[PDB]
Amino acid sequence: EVQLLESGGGLVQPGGSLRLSCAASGFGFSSYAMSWVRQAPGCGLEWVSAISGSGGSTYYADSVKGRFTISRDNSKNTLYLQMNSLRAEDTAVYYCARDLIHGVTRNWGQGTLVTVSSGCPPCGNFMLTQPHSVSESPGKTVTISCTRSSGSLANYYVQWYQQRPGQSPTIVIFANNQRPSGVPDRFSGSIDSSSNSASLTISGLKTEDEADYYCQTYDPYSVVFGCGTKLTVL
């Protein structure tokens, strides 16, 4: 029932302004934090900005620190996103996401397309690392590693999302090991604390499992999406 609908995306020139919106429903909008995640074509997820329930705390990414303005209107149940000094690098698909807490995304929107016109941006204070791609025959088991560079991994919850080609990313594993109701039980999530890594495990692969898998944790100051691992089913 939780619906997040992005709007306001369109064609724009370098150095212009554009404000996206997101009419949320299915939950008390004032009771949850919200964030924006962009994705250039054929690239990985890239966290943009975050904002808290009451709005007191706003977190911006390094690429758009100050260039963008995250904001919300809890009376209208609408999350916004003011964009200024629009650069060619900002062309991406901007998603609307709900956050159970800081840096823990739980629901995703459809998206909206923003194009700035008159190679992919990098992915990974701290960084995550997942293998480029892993493959396995159907019916077998596969595990995808996600190793954190700096800062304890057990101190910050880790999420796992699945993105099929052309689909929007859906949560499959959050809070390190917690699985959303509806996600199949063959998708398990664990964390090895000594090696400082989180692992998503799919037992008994199916042909529909073939998609991108992004891991994501946080710190008190930012959210970080892993580069992503293309799971190839044979």
DSSP, residue by residue, 162-203: EE-TTSPPEEEEBTTTB--TTS-TTEEEEEETTTTEEEEEES
| Beta pairing, strands 142-148 & 197-202 | antiparallel
Contact by Cβ (8 Å): 200, 172:
yes
The DSSP secondary-structure symbol of 122 reads: P
According to DSSP, residue 36 is labeled: E
- The span from the CA of 35 to the CA of 48, in Å, is 7
| Closest C-alpha among 223, 170, 232 to residue 36 | 223
In angstroms, this model's resolution equals 2.4
1.10.10.10, 3.90.1150.10, 3.40.50.720, 2.60.40.10: CATH of 128-233: 2.60.40.10
The residue type found at 82 is: Q
Sign of CA dihedral 113, 119, 125, 130: positive
Please tell me if the domain spanning 3-116 has the same topology as the one spanning 128-233.
Answer: yes
Strands 95-101, 92-93: pairing is: unpaired
How many angstroms separate the CA atoms of 114 and 216, rounded?
24
Q: How far is CA 18 from the centre of its chain?
A: 21
Sign of CA dihedral 6, 8, 221, 153: positive
**For the chain, which residues make up each domain, given as ranges?**
3-116, 128-233
* Residue 38 near residue 50, CB atoms below 8 Å: no
CATH class of 3-116: mainly beta
- Residue 27: is it exposed, middle or buried by C-beta count within 10 angstroms (0-12/13-18/19+)? middle
Nearest to 172, CA basis, from 152, 198, 147: 198
What residue has token string 């007191």?
56
